[PDB]
Design a protein around this nucleic acid. Sequence first.
DNA 1: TCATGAATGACTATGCACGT
DNA 2: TCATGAATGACTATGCACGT
Lengths: 247, 245, 487, 487
Amino acid sequence: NALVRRKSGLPGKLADCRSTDPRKSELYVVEGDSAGGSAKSGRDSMFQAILPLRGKIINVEKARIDRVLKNTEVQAIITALGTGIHDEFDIGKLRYHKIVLMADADVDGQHISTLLLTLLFRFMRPLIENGHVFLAQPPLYKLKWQRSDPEFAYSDRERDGLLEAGLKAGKKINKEDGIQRYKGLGEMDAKELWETTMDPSVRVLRQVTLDDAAAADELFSILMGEDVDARRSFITRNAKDVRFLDV
Amino acid sequence: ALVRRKGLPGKLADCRSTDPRKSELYVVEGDSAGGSAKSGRDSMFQAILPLRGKIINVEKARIDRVLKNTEVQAIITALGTGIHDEFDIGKLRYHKIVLMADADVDGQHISTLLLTLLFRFMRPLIENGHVFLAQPPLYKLKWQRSDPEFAYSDRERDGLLEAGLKAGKKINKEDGIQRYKGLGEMDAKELWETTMDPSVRVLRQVTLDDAAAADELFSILMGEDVDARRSFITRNAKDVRFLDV
Amino acid sequence: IEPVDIEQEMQRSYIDYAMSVIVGRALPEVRDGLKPVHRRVLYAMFDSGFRPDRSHAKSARSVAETMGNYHPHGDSSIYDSLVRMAQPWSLRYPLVDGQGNFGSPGNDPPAAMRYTEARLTPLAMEMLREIDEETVDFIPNYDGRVQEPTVLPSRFPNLLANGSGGIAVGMATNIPPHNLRELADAVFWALENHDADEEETLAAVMGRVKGPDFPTAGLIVGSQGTADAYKTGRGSIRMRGVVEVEEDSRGRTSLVITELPYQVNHDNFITSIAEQVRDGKLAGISNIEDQSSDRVGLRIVIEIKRDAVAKVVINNLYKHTQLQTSFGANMLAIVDGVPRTLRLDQLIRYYVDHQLDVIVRRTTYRLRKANERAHILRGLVKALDALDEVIALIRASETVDIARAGLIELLDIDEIQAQAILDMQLRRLAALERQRIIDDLAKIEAEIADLEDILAKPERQRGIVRDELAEIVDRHGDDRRTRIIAI
Amino acid sequence: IEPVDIEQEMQRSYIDYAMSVIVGRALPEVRDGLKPVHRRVLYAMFDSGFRPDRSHAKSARSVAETMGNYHPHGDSSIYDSLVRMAQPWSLRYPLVDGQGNFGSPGNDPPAAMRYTEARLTPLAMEMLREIDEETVDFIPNYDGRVQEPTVLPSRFPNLLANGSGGIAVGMATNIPPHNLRELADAVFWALENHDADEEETLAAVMGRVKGPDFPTAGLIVGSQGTADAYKTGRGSIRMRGVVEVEEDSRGRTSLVITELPYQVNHDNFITSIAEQVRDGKLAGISNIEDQSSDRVGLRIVIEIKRDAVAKVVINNLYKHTQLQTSFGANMLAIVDGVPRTLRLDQLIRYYVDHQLDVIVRRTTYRLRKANERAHILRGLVKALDALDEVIALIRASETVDIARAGLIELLDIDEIQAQAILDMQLRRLAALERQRIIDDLAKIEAEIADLEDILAKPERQRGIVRDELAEIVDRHGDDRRTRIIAI
DNA sequence: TCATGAATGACTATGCACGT
DNA sequence: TCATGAATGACTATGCACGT
Ligand SMILES: C[C@H]1COc2c(N3CCN(C)CC3)c(F)cc3c(=O)c(C(=O)O)cn1c23
Ligand SMILES: C[C@H]1COc2c(N3CCN(C)CC3)c(F)cc3c(=O)c(C(=O)O)cn1c23
Ligand SMILES: [Mg+2]
Ligand SMILES: [Mg+2]
Ligand SMILES: [Mg+2]
Ligand SMILES: [Mg+2]
């Protein structure tokens, strides 16, 4: 199976890859024009394509279907993925066997992720069931050692760990420049994105798994649905214990 | 009498008076100045047409391209008259066309681009004294106890300051004399009391003396011939200060 | 590649968004009535010195300073928040003094950042009063380079005064603005009756706060909705504009609208009436003309037909337009990091609690600084009594460390105090200058005693809130705008 | 209403615009090679402390500071100017250190102000070196609130180094960038041969400045255009990219473009070749593939048909694409407020003249301050020699003025010196500190002697330019990028 | 279906001179 | 016709909850 990539009927903002093999191809769905721009530069153009999303995605759980299909950002995703939606879905027409969602580490990136996962689960569920959907974990810190190569950290803990280890090893950091803190993908350049989220030999990806379909169906409808009361009581009930989900 | 919108440009803030003889069109530089002008105007007799960006040079550009320009279409449509041979003074919807631009050099430039459009496409508007130029303020003297005064030149500023201090008035050395760097920095009230209130506004009526002499000057300054323009500036820029001496 | 279940991801991710929005974006803190963007803009302007005792700074500088130190978001939306705080038709008591084009109550948008200048208003200066005296908790900013305030001193009840509206997740707030003088009376009562229970307090505060006071004036019809909002935290308050019937020389009648209810767009209002005649559901109207100007304010003239009754047309406008519209009050605010719907007595009480906290903390800070200052002065006085020796002692010392170490031993003094003796100028060795040091010690010891007396007497603490707030209201308090009538 | 003739208005108005654009917008000052916006951005960042010894500040803060104090224009276009100065493919020696997405040589636009941070580069620090020592004239800003520099010290020939392109009225400039090390040699010669005439100087400078050195590397073909530009001020310099023919195992040959001439958009270049094939104007080409990446740089692989000669296809690319394109040199710059086309010897000479002025002015400033510091120290030494007395007099004084007036009588002292004695701390009465005051006087009188020697000898002055510039080149100078070949 | 307001920027058109 | 580079900003779409 092989499909043609655009080179001078696909979304205008899509920076397609060169490889015509979906099994080896990857679509990075990126939050923001800035981050998408740097991703387009730092990527491996052979296997990696970039689809920058602009603004918060439409909630397909709340909005009527006709309005969802009128949304330009949804059309871009559906067109780029090549598969249909709902009953007309066909995995054989999938243009990328890896769909990486890359959003800011901040709170709005988390929101956009739920909006995208809602789109995928409702319109193109088999992509999730067959492990084609991934989540890129962006860095939070860049430790700029004076003489050594810079290190990236993906959590406050790792930052503290790499700092102590380096100092214990005799390395040194400026207390001015020091540890750069990333507040979003848009703040990174092309090189930084490659060496943290796009280089397949270093990137930290999470594969979205779907266990209980019925339980997921209910969670999606509570959180993303039109019923506010149901959503309000769920948050006040479970927000108190978000920290302890993995303990 | 002609109908006012309540088939004309979307950005036109038309007046209420249906009599062109009593009506005035303020052609304003910038959305900011045009916005505050729309508020400070006398909605009865004064209409506002905000222009966005540098106007296209009709002297350089071909005719068809000029007619595709949205800013030109707005002017032609709002004025009601035709252009060139199809021009008709009878359909003039405003007998007063006030060009209001910033006091800075780009405002000066936009004026020359507008005067070029008018002179080439709708010359009779100039010949019959329907084209005016609003002179914006440059300074606002904010007295501590007295009403604020507006100045239209550095000299007037120094004069009003000297008179006021001599009369016993006082100003803060912080707030002090606000200096305007453009119409966009003004609010609705300030624009009314300086450029739109008919009892205080400083308008200059554009007159056309020698049509042939004007025709060549427009072609030198605005035409495609750079050499002719380059030599004209190096020849006459030396003496611009002494044009009215 | 690590595996993650979609249910775990969706739940963790959406709750993190919901909670941060609730606590950290859309809803006001009960103590100062500010959302994070408001608090960060105001403090940025404050720290930058963009105050009413200096000229308006370019508003771009305020946005950029907010962006670079406190609010890690976009210049565009931050400017929008700043602009709102400067519009007299949005805030009952504007916190930003805007210079230039900041828009209109209609569809005229504000000028871009570059065209406008801005500074804090005198009342906003009361929001930040003595914020530098440890009156509020500070936390590190978004990258730990600098500190930002968790809440402002807020020396006037800003939440109730300016109100607040915000859409969060799972909930939303909609608090109307109120008249400062009425709120002050409520606070004054709460301070006097500090032991009164919630039942008595609610009765007293409701008697003094007659209802919301909108910046757009207008009318409030009925009393039930207001009462509901104060007793429940939710109520529907009916608003109305002002209509005055005029007669013509011919003998034609016309309706003149000079006021509209809160948050009604002037242009959308005129357009709605125009479209409702087009189809024709507002017969009796003959002509619609907007005779508004910067000099007469709002003035929408509605000429009616000869076979039309004025009140009939007015009643139709009440029904089919926002000439009469209701304010859906929902008293939701963040209390100690938790969203809570509050009664009016709770809103006042929580604010009073904040003011008492502020003044105790200020008193503590001033008391600590006074003791440090007195401590050093005591050391100087010891040096003066043995001045002949102290000078000789320092001179005969090869270094300043030898001189310092000696001063401790010679006068039995701390190292901090000894450092101050070294730091002393030859100026203060003059006769009158030696005397100033003595008197200054006596001066402070009187201040320390006073400060200690304040901390020991809850009565004085409450008295300071009252007296200081009274000054603010006398200076910045204004007349009621919204007229309250019955059914 | 006053009448005005259209010819009077048109002439005055357009000339005022033309002159301001020519002198005050589009064209570079010959001394520092900067347009006003550049100079104002850089000074704003400098004054704000956005220097290499501190972290990158949010670029919004730089824009706002420039906008609010120096450059009365829009945030959008000012940001565009700041961004350009940070791109290594635009400036041969970047003046802004950008952090984040600042675009690419292709059609990838820079990130918005929001996402990027910025500070000055070490070389930009040389542009502003000792600007606070009265090395350049300052004038009031656009509203007389603050002062701004008319020109920067520019301690390296920035105009020739980074070049300049600008469209004005009636004229335009297009100066290419040059290799700093080569420019320094030219300057070193001009300083040594300061009496040489224009005939000799032009010959010497042209021998050392071998030609333009573009940040995008590439090739320069021929020598005529370069020579014309330096002798006339106008010249057409032919540029070329770099092409490497590779052979595959299949027999297919392909052309690999790894460099392009100055100011050629990578994406427009690929699109041009692709569209020329579509219509069919570059036969012999089989396939176009962009194998470029952040790690290998530019790499455009052009596979050609087997019945095609590589050299034929390359010549076809030179003719019908910007793989070969000419740089239209027009050495136009503002000299003393007047636009002038300059020979290469004039450009160097004018820069050298500027450097000499800077160092004479710096020396004058340092000499004045040295005299002031020495003047006060002389008073201090007098106090130390009669220290026992100095204390007694101050003690008996009712005021400090009584103490001051006496110090004048006792030691025969100015009012400034006596005041300095008064402001003296007991810190400095220690042994080593008293000795420090003595030695410090001796140090300055040695510095004053040195400084006076500089002003009296033009030889040393030229020596300072040479030696200081030499340090700059050794630290920040780099290899040539653009290779110069013959026909 | 529209308003609220604090969150997630690219695109659009001209002046000006010069060379393709 | 297009690129250059400083000059002169509005419009476009979603989330979120609630009331007409
Ligand atoms: C998130 C960025 C980019 O996308 C945006 C919009 N688009 C959404 C996607 N497209 C359907 C076209 C319209 C938009 F209409 C407005 C804004 C906006 O106001 C904004 C700001 O900072 O204030 C920032 N953005 C906006
Ligand atoms: C003058 C304002 C308003 O007009 C502008 C544009 N057009 C909009 C649609 N019109 C049909 C013709 C003009 C434009 F394409 C770009 C800009 C722009 O970049 C800008 C700035 O500060 O960077 C400021 N402005 C622009
Ligand atoms: Mg983000
Ligand atoms: Mg202007
Ligand atoms: Mg926005
Ligand atoms: Mg622009």
